Design a protein around this ligand. Structure first.
Ligand SMILES: CN1CCC(c2ccc(-c3ccc4c(c3)C(=O)N([C@H](c3cccc(F)c3)c3nc5ccccc5[nH]3)C4)cc2)CC1
Ligand SMILES: Nc1ncnc2c1ncn2[C@@H]1O[C@H](COP(=O)(O)OP(=O)(O)NP(=O)(O)O)[C@@H](O)[C@H]1O
Ligand SMILES: [Mg+2]
Length: 292
């Protein structure tokens, strides 16, 4: 459906403030000025690294239409594109940022309820991408965006190097499947349970494949019970077909989310903020009106 990707003019939007960069380009906080109107609508804008040719832009558009066609509460959708020399991409602005920075800044105030619900939502989004036959290839806490504290969405999928998030067969044989995404999901969960720790911190990326082949894995986070750690370890099995399926990950984390303090051991957990019905309805009406 071509109607899901809006082709924008350079003159109808403006970059306002840089937000960061990653690997494909630089992300800005921007404003869309609807023509003939007086309003300023905040947007996110990604300007590509290098300028491109009409041929490479066709490759861009072909993938852009796919990323504009997703429809799931836990998966971000691409909204627009500006075909300038350097192409500019447009999606919804998430004022809370990515989940990695969120858990790092709130590391002393995040309860077991939020952590397990984030795992559920990430698996729900990943299960949708598999249903659409879309391989993520870059699943990580940095590519999980926070719309509201109770609602996260996965982003930056389908962009065919994050060595420390890749499955062993991706490092060794550039093999990317939905089962290699499960490995990245396991590392993503590890990031959340360590409140944003860098996986294999201090180990050179050139040696990661060596340590994985000989049997070493990311260590058990201090707040994790053995039940949670064994899920992460199953995501990191050498046989890709032995790793759990995302639909299985949804069920298992939903079970643990029903009794969070038995599976996560967090200091002050009984004193952390729970999602209130009053808070969730307020958040929805102001920032998050989608179906759910
Ligand atoms: C020879 N030459 C090699 C490279 C070249 C090329 C370059 C770029 C894209 C391409 C095409 C399309 C997307 C991306 C990137 C890319 O990074 N995207 C993110 C994405 C992915 C999935 C869902 C979603 F909502 C967003 C994203 N982050 C944003 C942040 C702010 C504003 C807009 C944003 N858009 C979408 C494809 C091919 C073509 C051939
Ligand atoms: N729609 C958005 N709303 C708010 N912040 C965003 C949005 N898209 C991206 N960002 C942020 O912009 C910064 C740069 O994003 P990006 O260029 O994708 O880098 P990255 O995610 O760190 N690297 P990569 O793994 O390649 O995607 C990060 O801090 C993102 O969280
Ligand atoms: Mg990203």
């Amino acid at each position: 459906n071509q109607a899901l990707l809006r082709i924008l003019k350079e003159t109808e939007f403006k970059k306002i403030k840089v937000l960061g960069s990653g690997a494909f380009g630089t992300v800005y906080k921007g404003l869309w000025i609807p023509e003939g109107e007086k309003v300023k609508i905040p947007v996110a804008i990604k300007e590509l690294r290098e300028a491109t040719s009409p041929k490479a832009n066709k490759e861009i558009l072909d993938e852009a239409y796919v990323m504009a066609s997703v429809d799931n509460p836990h998966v971000c959708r691409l909204l627009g594109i500006c075909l300038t020399s350097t192409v500019q991409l447009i999606m919804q602005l998430m004022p809370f940022g990515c989940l990695l920075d969120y858990v790092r800044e709130h590391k002393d105030n995040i309860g077991s309820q939020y952590l397990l619900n984030w795992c559920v939502q990430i698996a729900k989004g990943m299960n949708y991408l598999e249903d659409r036959r879309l391989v993520h290839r870059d699943l990580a806490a940095r590519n999980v965006l926070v719309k509201t504290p109770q609602h996260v969405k996965i982003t930056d999928f389908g962009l065919a190097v994050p060595i420390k998030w890749m499955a062993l067969e991706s490092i060794l044989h550039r093999i990317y499947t939905h089962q290699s995404d499960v490995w990245s999901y396991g590392v993503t969960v590890w990031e959340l349970m360590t409140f944003g720790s860098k996986p294999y911190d201090g180990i050179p990326a050139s040696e990661i494949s060596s340590i994985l082949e000989k049997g070493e894995r990311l260590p058990q986070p201090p707040i994790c019970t053995i039940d949670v750690y064994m899920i992460m370890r199953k995501c990191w099995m050498i046989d890709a077909d032995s790793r759990p399926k995302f639909r299985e990950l949804i069920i298992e984390f939903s079970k643990m989310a029903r009794d969070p303090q038995r599976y996560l051991v967090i200091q002050g957990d009984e004193r952390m903020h729970l999602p209130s019905p009053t808070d969730s309805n307020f958040y929805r009406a102001l920032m998050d009106e989608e179906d759910m």
